[PDB]
Write a protein that binds this ligand. Sequence first.
Ligand code: XJ7
Ligand code: NA
Lengths: 577, 80, 80
Amino acid sequence: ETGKTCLLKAMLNLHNGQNDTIALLLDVARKTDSLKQFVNASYTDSYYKGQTALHIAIERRNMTLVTLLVENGADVQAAANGDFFKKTKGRPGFYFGELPLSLAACTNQLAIVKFLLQNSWQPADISARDSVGNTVLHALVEVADNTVDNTKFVTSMYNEILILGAKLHPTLKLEEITNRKGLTPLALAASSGKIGVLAYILQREIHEPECRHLSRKFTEWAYGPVHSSLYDLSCIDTCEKNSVLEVIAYSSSETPNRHDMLLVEPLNRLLQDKWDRFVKRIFYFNFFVYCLYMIIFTAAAYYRPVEGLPPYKLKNTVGDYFRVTGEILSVSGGVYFFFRGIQYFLQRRPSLKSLFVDSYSEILFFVQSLFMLVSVVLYFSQRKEYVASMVFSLAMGWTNMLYYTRGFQQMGIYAVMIEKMILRDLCRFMFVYLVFLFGFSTAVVTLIEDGKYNSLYSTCLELFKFTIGMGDLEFTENYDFKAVFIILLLAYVILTYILLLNMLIALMGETVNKIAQESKNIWKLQRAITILDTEKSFLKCMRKAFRSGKLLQVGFTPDGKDDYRWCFRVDEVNWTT
Amino acid sequence: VYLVFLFGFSTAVVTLIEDGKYNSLYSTCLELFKFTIGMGDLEFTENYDFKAVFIILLLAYVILTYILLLNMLIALMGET
Amino acid sequence: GKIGVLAYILQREIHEPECRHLSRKFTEWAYGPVHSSLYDLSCIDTCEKNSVLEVIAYSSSETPNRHDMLLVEPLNRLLQ
Ligand SMILES: CCCCCCCCCCCCC(=O)O[C@@H](COC(=O)CCC)COP(=O)(O)O[C@H]1[C@H](O)[C@@H](O)[C@@H](O)[C@@H](O)[C@@H]1O
Ligand code: NA
């Protein structure tokens, strides 16, 4: 059924790492006809397909047993590609890369990986890929979970494997190998939210001759307390497939450490530098142009004609020429924002949930433009209702100005606090409030069906007035069920003020250094997105966003060639040697 | 932030209704400001041609203004 | 409301010869970092006299640790 052999049974059932049956079975296999097909026996059931004796030896941490298995000619490139050993985590399983080298690496067994790479009989292929296209480094990235001990052992194993691979194959660049999705280990770590691995990779130093070129952090010069270091920006700002900033900024909002991954040492200063060099002036220019657009729109709408039945004839006086010019400019701006919204939605392809849980401002600007277009259509159709649509554009046009509070730290954080308070707390309050309002409105309309309480709309407005301090408890009318009406109104007022008090108290549970920290990180992420969009637009056919220049870091690769890497300078001071 | 919101809604209200306490920007700004201090006017006893659109604007303004006030009050407790 | 004794009893492990049947928490299998465990659930879900869940839920509110006794490892997962 499963294909289990006597060898696998002996491998599974042993005590203290020893079972003399294994050696006897191997000797009998040698003497009978051959050992090759016996030692390399493996399961055939799809749930455990591909597993052989080497995997069991590695799992049980038995060095002598795996050494014997390799000595007898065991295949060290077998793929344990059963359903148990892969993703689709709807069931028990453990994905490790399907290969014995990846299995030893992922279980923190350094001696076994060293033996597998540097044995006398059959060395392992360090560059091999599994069914998904993942190398050993991709597997190491996959098994990370950002805890302390996990990060420690994964980092150490990653460093050791990289150094050994450099020594055995000086011409091999392991970190450039991509899986089926086109992701390198750095891109995979960045997009998956593996902050501990990213923080190691981006600023690693390897102080060992003949493999110093593997480092990404160097030292340009040193004085006494002060010294200057260089950070490599290869595939950080531009990569032509997937840069770190691109995969962090444009993630799908489900990455666990989406906000925190921008706080590592090189990226924060890189984004601040990009902001300070060229992006700030363009942002302020766009803000100014939007302000001019809104002033012209407001002035044009203010002086509309009051005659009925549009369209209106153009007169020969000056004010009408200015008015029609303003109308034309407003409609042009609406068309511009309409096309920009379409371009965003087509170029990003949001997944029907990323539309609303993120990117609100795109929706708001698009809705403003839709109102403008509906106003135009009604204007030329000889309808007077266009004014209504126009004003719903105009009011929105002012509130959308809050978009430009980013670029200023305090106002940006304040706006982020506003947005989160709306999206988290108000939605819960309004549901309960509307339930109470509708219930008491129906009761009041039923009790009194005349005199300002003959409909649900009027009664709802009259009860809403009580919530804003504009109520009416005079009781001058001669109702049939007065003294029952009074009890209902008093109960409604008391319950509504209990609800308001409870809301106010509940909102204090966010000022425990909770929102204060989540904001400023959300603001930094927003400004990062703005920087990336501005760079991608660039408005001039100019792409001079590069950093400190083609500096020479080491200049001595394993070959005679010298290397240049577009580094970023950081100067530091330390008064404790 | 409050002044930006007030100016925007005042211009919208003057444009929608051009007579009867809403024929100037100063008067409309005062009338909308009265809501913030609990002295508003939601009687709707006049015969405006754009009634029932005016109500929606006033309700939206009131809700947004109280959102801003709540956000201020909560945010200012981070200094305590 | 003896939280400590309940927490001990519900997940005790006795690994010794001739008396391991006294355990209520067992190990089904172990891969490397991953493994699977089994909880007994005898007289937790139903026993027709006094189950743990019925006793905790329908207490008279004078029990000290009425809220915390449902946070022990098997009961929270069972209820979810
Ligand atoms: C006439 C009636 C008028 C009604 C107007 C109603 C208020 C207008 C307010 C205008 C503010 C414009 C704006 O700036 O939009 C705000 C949110 O808008 C709202 O509150 C909508 C309320 C519905 C920011 O959204 P943002 O596009 O920055 O997305 C954020 C990411 O960038 C970030 O990384 C985080 O992932 C974050 O979780 C994301 O949100
Ligand atoms: Na009042």
